[PDB]
Ligand binder design. Structure first.
Ligand code: ATP
Ligand code: ATP
Lengths: 97, 101, 366, 242, 97, 159, 106
């Protein structure tokens, strides 16, 4: 991501200081088809980062939910006072989050 | 530079040691002590609430002598709040001093 | 959780070695390589966008015959278990409906009756018994403490159906086992090729040589050697022949393309006018887009199966100026060859000009 | 005593006064379609379908989801959940009794395994365009409807009531199975797998065509879109090379 | 009306997941209020299930909570992914403009 | 005794039927594909007859061979009459040999010499002319080892 | 269940082995014969090398081919001394093709 954001700004900046020359030499389409490519590479880098972070969250949340089940069943069929059932349930739920 | 098979897979964990005890050595143990105390108090208030709640599960008729449970809950909650206020200040002080040095 | 809320840092300064190092090339070639066929068989072309022909269940059966031995046993066992179970359930339902379960339970709770004169299928009382009766009927065991009386015709229909389907299963599975046992010699192909190619000097002209050998104690019959050069050309009228394969003679005492393969050999190829190797020089033969294919064909007398072995050469691997060490050596009482000197090559006097000129300048000296 | 499927009591297996009118027999007839589907589909799926009948070195990269995609997966998941509920209710009810009467529980577990295997069949069919095979699924679902339907009516003829859990479970399952049957019919209509004038023709979808499409999140199945399986490969590829 | 539909779809999924998410506290209360009071014997129980009765079978509610959590986390994460992709497309269009 | 013997024979025969079926499973259908029509181009300063052959298999055809024939109603100068006579046209390789290796689609070519019957024909008046070009491609499949031969033809209307 | 499955599989394997023998029934050992001495004689005023080959079996072989080689340690002109040099030699038939018909001793 940090590697695909430096060029995407630089290009814009260039096309901002040289408008008279750029619009004279009539190379507009050659530059637009480059702005599009730069911005698309940057967007795909960001999208893959966001998908990876969400992937991690989904997997770890399912692991936490499995913990929730294996804690509730352990506390249900066991020999313990109700204080350590209520505390256990609540804390095992927060651990998941 | 062959980091991926070998360098990347292990965390730096050595520059990290320098960062942890960076501003000195007495600005770290304060953070560790305050963190552990705050976390233990934050668990203990709920533990006490559970014990008080559980001790009267059967005593349906008389909800009396509830001054001890209330006193315990209030004192533990106040102490926990104080430790919570302390710990963050300790951590931020450590970070600021480490950055300065 | 929202790592970069503070977005303010932008265009403050980066100004660095990203590519403006000036002492390191910015470019990253990354060195991808494409060859017509891989170094170890497996022709690597790219068919795509071909009008597909769908599928048909005969292809599924065709897959069934071609399986590794550690999966045929598994499919065998699963087939047998599923068949026994399915017919056990059918028998259990038949026993339920005809009023046999109730009769046996009521007259065996009190042993006073001892009545088995009116039952659909004797001595089937539970699902366990049904799943032991189905065993006694499918495998032709027939323990026979459980006869089938003649009355309930639904049971007889189920028996006919199950016996015939069981025979089908047995016949198909026996066929699979026999087919896989007959074609059991056909392990794989084990033709060993030298990797590096020399261009020595011999018999007044250059060459093109490598080494090939076998490992199976059966030599290969009617072996044939074909050598081709792969390059893109165009007509003088200019049409793009995308990857033209050109056939080139492999020299021999009578100009015929059989070779007898017992001790490893040199496979010469004299460069002459028609050969595309007329125009390649010493310092030239590191830069070129060429691919020389070698195709070996024969049959193995043991298994009686025709085999074709493929390999590929590129101009980058070929190392001018060498030849192959004489691997053989007359031993104490019998010839021998050490394949350990397979890829070993040595250097000897090698002219640096092109055979294009090795007759143009008529001095064997270069 | 034994490990029964209608209890340890003699009068629970009788077949007088209605062979389809004794509840345990209706339970078995419901058990039949599930095991039939399982026994047809486990060997068929195991036998593999990968015979390279042509140059398939770059043909495996394309697969086009069948006409009705999202409703089938979501409804099948709903059926899995409803069957889980029925299993749970059965287990609890048996746990409130003396013997181990199995007619409340085992049919539901068999149904669970059968529905899971049904979705397995759908996935393994879809990856390889070969529409004919999915006719099997049609039969399964259709057959299933009949059996389950009888239970409802045979409850309604005895008036078990609309307040009881079992009535609710059976009704939910009946209507969900019907909707899935509708999905199958629509697949038959759009893909032309049996008796339209001829099998239809389509071009496989355009991202997968160009080998630049790698962030394949928009192009995969909903149960895999939900647990982000599309990224899986790349992440486990973090050891080999950057 | 241009690049906003998927945000509405994400909001629908988010609302449904948010509604199902509260099953943690309620199931915790049910399980706790079942485990405490003693119910050893002699209560008539011939009829198999009473709609109200199913909800408090203490072990049962644990399974219901497990499934509810493992569904809520997946639905919420799906919502996040849809809205993220919408945002990335919106940024790309705005930069191009 | 009679019934047991008959049963044993019947079982053996049907077992043989299943073995033959399994053996003849693998082959499916012919798979070498020839073009809709051919071409007659100019290549290297002399006209050449070209056609296109492709493969659809996964394996490759061992020892493939291609042969080309010219069908024409003919006579001999001394008076004999030949009714649907065949012949053969020399397919060309730089080595005068006919084995061909088919992994990429190929364009088989044949060069017109003074001695092929495809030399005295005109250009405009080929479409109205009694000729036929038969292509025969034989080989041995590597996977199952069954020799196969696939045939096709091009006529005047489709050249 | 375990014993039944093992028994049927064993029956299949044994049937297969017996099938292999019944298929190799027609196979036998080496059956072509060459003399115990070559000869070197004069044919049409030319000094030529000849030997004798025969078949001692039931059938007539198809599409025979007789190839002759010389294994010798020659001297390579430029040091590529290959000790066991195999050089092919041309058999004679007025069509310049090796194939030979084997009915009587040749
Ligand atoms: N003794 C051998 N056994 C098996 N294969 C061999 C042997 N010698 C050479 N080869 C084959 O030669 C090919 C070239 O391999 P490589 O270049 O690694 O070794 P080499 O230089 O040819 O021989 P060596 O390894 O003895 O130096 C390989 O495909 C290999 O299979
Ligand atoms: N890409 C392909 N995929 C599958 N089969 C093909 C392909 N190209 C050609 N064929 C087969 O080769 C034969 C010759 O095809 P050719 O392209 O010469 O004819 P065509 O005029 O394109 O035929 P059509 O009009 O049916 O497309 C056809 O019968 C076809 O079955």
């Amino acid at each position: 991501d940090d590697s695909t954001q430096l060029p995407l700004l630089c290009h814009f900046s260039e096309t901002a200081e040289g408008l008279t020359t750029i619009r004279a030499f009539r190379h507009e389409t050659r530059f637009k088809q480059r702005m599009l490519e730069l911005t698309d590479t940057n967007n795909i880098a960001y999208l893959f980062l966001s998908a990876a972070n969400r992937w991690l969250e989904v997997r770890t949340d399912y692991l936490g939910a499995c913990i929730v089940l294996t804690a509730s069943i352990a506390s249900i069929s066991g020999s313990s006072n109700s204080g350590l059932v209520g505390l256990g349930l609540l804390y095992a739920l927060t651990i998941t989050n | 530079m062959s980091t991926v098979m070998r360098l990347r897979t292990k965390m730096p964990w050595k520059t990290c040691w320098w960062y942890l005890t960076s501003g000195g050595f007495f600005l770290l143990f304060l953070m560790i002590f305050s963190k552990l105390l705050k976390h233990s108090v934050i668990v203990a208030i709920d533990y006490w609430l559970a014990t008080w709640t559980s001790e009267y599960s059967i005593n349906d008729p008389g909800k009396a002598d509830q001054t001890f449970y209330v006193a315990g809950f209030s004192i533990l909650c106040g102490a926990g709040i104080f430790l919570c206020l302390v710990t963050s200040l300790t951590v931020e002080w450590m970070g600021l001093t480490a950055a300065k040095n | 959780m929202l790592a970069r809320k503070s977005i303010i840092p932008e265009e403050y300064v980066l100004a660095r070695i990203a590519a403006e190092n000036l002492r390191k090339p910015r470019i990253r070639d990354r060195l991808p390589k494409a060859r017509f066929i891989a170094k170890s068989g497996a022709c690597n072309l790219a068919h795509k966008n071909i009008r597909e022909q769908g599928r048909f269940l005969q292809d599924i059966f065709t897959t069934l015959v071609d399986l590794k031995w550690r999966h045929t046993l598994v499919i065998f066992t699963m087939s047998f278990l599923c068949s026994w179970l399915l017919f056990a359930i059918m028998w259990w339902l038949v026993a339920f409906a005809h009023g046999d379960i109730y009769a046996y339970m009521e007259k065996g709770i009190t042993e006073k009756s001892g009545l088995e004169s009116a039952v659909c299928v004797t001595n089937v009382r539970s699902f366990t018994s049904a799943f032991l009766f189905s065993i006694e009927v499918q495998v032709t065991i027939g323990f026979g403490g459980r006869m089938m009386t003649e009355e309930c015709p639904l049971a007889i229909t189920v028996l006919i159906l199950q016996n015939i389907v069981g025979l089908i299963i047995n016949a198909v599975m026996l066929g699979c086992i026999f087919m896989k046992t007959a074609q059991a010699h056909r392990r794989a192909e084990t033709l060993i090729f030298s990797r590096h190619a020399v261009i020595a000097v011999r018999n007044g002209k250059l060459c093109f040589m490598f080494r090939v050998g076998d490992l199976r104690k059966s030599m290969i019959i009617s072996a044939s050697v074909r050598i081709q050069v792969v390059k893109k050309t165009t007509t003088p009228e200019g049409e793009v022949v995308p990857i033209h394969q050109q056939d080139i003679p492999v020299d021999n005492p009578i100009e015929s393309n059989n070779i007898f393969l017992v001790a490893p050999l040199i496979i010469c190829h004299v460069i002459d006018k028609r050969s595309p190797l007329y125009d390649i020089s010493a310092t030239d033969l590191v830069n070129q887009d060429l691919e020389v294919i070698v195709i070996l064909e024969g049959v193995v007398e043991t298994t009686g199966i025709t085999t074709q072995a493929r390999t590929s050469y590129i101009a980058e691997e070929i190392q001018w100026g060498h030849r192959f060490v004489s691997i053989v050596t007359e031993e104490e009482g019998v010839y021998s060859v050490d394949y350990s000197k397979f890829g070993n090559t040595v250097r000897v006097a090698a002219p640096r000009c092109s055979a294009r000129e090795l007759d143009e300048k008529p001095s064997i000296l270069i | 005593m034994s490990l029964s499927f209608c209890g340890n009591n003699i009068s629970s297996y009788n077949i007088y006064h209605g062979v389809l009118q004794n509840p345990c027999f209706v339970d078995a007839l419901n058990l039949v379609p599930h095991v039939f589907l399982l026994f047809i589909t486990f060997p068929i799926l195991f036998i593999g379908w990968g015979s390279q009948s042509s140059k398939v070195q770059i043909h495996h990269n394309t697969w086009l989801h069948f006409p009705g995609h999202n409703l089938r997966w979501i409804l099948t998941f709903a059926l899995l959940f409803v069957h889980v509920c029925e299993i749970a209710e059965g287990i609890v009810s048996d746990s409130q009794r003396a013997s181990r009467h199995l007619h409340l529980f085992m049919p539901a577990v068999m149904g669970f395994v059968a529905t899971t295997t049904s979705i397995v069949y759908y996935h393994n069919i879809e990856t390889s365009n070969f529409p004919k095979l999915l006719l099997a699924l049609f039969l399964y679902w259709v057959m299933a409807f009949i059996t389950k339907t009888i239970k409802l009516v045979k409850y309604w003829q005895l008036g078990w009531g609309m307040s009881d859990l079992r009535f609710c479970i059976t009704g939910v399952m009946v209507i969900l199975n019907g909707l899935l049957m509708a999905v199958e019919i629509n697949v038959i209509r759009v893909r032309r797998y049996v008796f339209f004038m001829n099998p239809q023709k389509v071009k496989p979808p355009e991202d997968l065509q160009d080998l630049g499409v790698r962030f394949l999140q928009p192009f995969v199945n909903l149960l895999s879109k939900a647990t982000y399986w599309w990224m899986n490969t790349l992440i486990i590829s973090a050891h080999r090379k950057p | 009306r241009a690049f906003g539909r998927p945000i509405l779809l994400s909001s629908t999924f988010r609302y449904l997941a948010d509604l199902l998410g509260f099953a943690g506290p309620l199931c915790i209360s049910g399980i706790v209020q079942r485990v405490n009071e003693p119910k050893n014997n002699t209560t008539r129980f011939s009829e198999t299930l009473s709609s109200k009765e199913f909800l408090e079978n203490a072990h049962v509610l644990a399974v219901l909570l497990f499934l509810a959590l493992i569904l809520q986390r997946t639905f919420l994460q799906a919502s996040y992914y849809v809205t993220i992709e919408t945002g990335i497309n919106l940024r790309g269009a705005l930069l191009a403009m």
